[PDB]
């Protein structure tokens, strides 16, 4: 196979075109995020100016991290944790928010800390602790080629494609989140901010729906 130059040129051209497509898609996604957040802010401002209240839409996804160990767990919460793939003590998973998943979270309330992650939290999670599920093996999300090989069926071509399908619950969110391996997060740097974790966050504890406060905890635990 003395002909290597043609193969190199073809591969380089294909990679250049793929990188250009990924760049244009990421630019479109950045424009979309800016447009959505600025539209939400301006809608709030306009309602307040007109004399009303703008009730934001309920968040579409949650991030759920186990907080409890593995010993002495009742069967129903244990099974729900297994179904949410929070096997280890500090594993984490994104979950679409519907009635069924809300009931799931209510069943596993005393063993998880969950909220709605921001784009910053989601992006940092995918970049640092993003791992795939190729051939039942947990491969790291090192290059966009790995993501294109498996999720090219659904149009998820890049890691930012994956982040987009995660942040905006989309047509293939189930497939994207299933492809993402359960994140193994470290303990929160600087502690949990609480003397005792095993009370609901409302009760001055750590578990339960922390909602918007989940970002700080997840960033510390990353």
């Amino acid at each position: 196979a003395e002909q290597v130059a043609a193969e190199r040129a073809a591969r380089k051209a294909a990679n250049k075109e793929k990188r250009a497509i990924i760049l244009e898609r990421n630019a479109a996604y950045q424009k979309e995020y800016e447009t959505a957040e600025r539209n939400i802010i301006q809608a709030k401002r306009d309602a307040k100016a007109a004399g009303s209240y703008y009730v934001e839409a309920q968040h579409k996804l949650v991030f759920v991290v186990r907080i409890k160990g593995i010993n002495k767990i009742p069967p129903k919460p244990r099974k729900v944790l297994q179904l949410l793939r929070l096997t280890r003590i500090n594993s984490g998973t994104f979950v679409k928010v519907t009635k069924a998943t809300l009931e799931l979270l209510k069943l596993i309330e005393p063993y998880v800390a969950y909220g709605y992650p921001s784009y910053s939290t989601i992006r940092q999670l995918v970049y640092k602790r993003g791992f795939g599920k190729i051939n039942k093996q947990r491969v790291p999300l090192s290059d966009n080629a790995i993501i294109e090989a498996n999720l090219g069926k659904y149009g998820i071509l890049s890691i930012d494609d994956l982040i987009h399908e995660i942040i905006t619950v989309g047509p293939h969110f189930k497939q994207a989140n299933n492809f993402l391996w359960p994140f193994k997060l470290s303990n929160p740097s600087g502690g949990w901010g609480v003397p005792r974790k095993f009370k609901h966050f409302i009760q001055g504890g750590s578990f339960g729906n922390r909602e918007e406060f989940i970002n700080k905890l997840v960033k510390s635990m990353n």
Partner: protein, 53 residues
Amino acid sequence: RVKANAAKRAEAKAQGVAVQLKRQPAQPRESRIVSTEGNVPQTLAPVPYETFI
């Protein structure tokens, strides 16, 4: 429901559109604006304890 999905699927195929035949769990409610025209909020506070016995 089986024949209902049959009817919707036939109609969607005739009109060349997606079927979306699956049910969906209760989705989170979308964003909406609540007016105050004749609905000024009423301030509510706890009630002090008074025995009825």
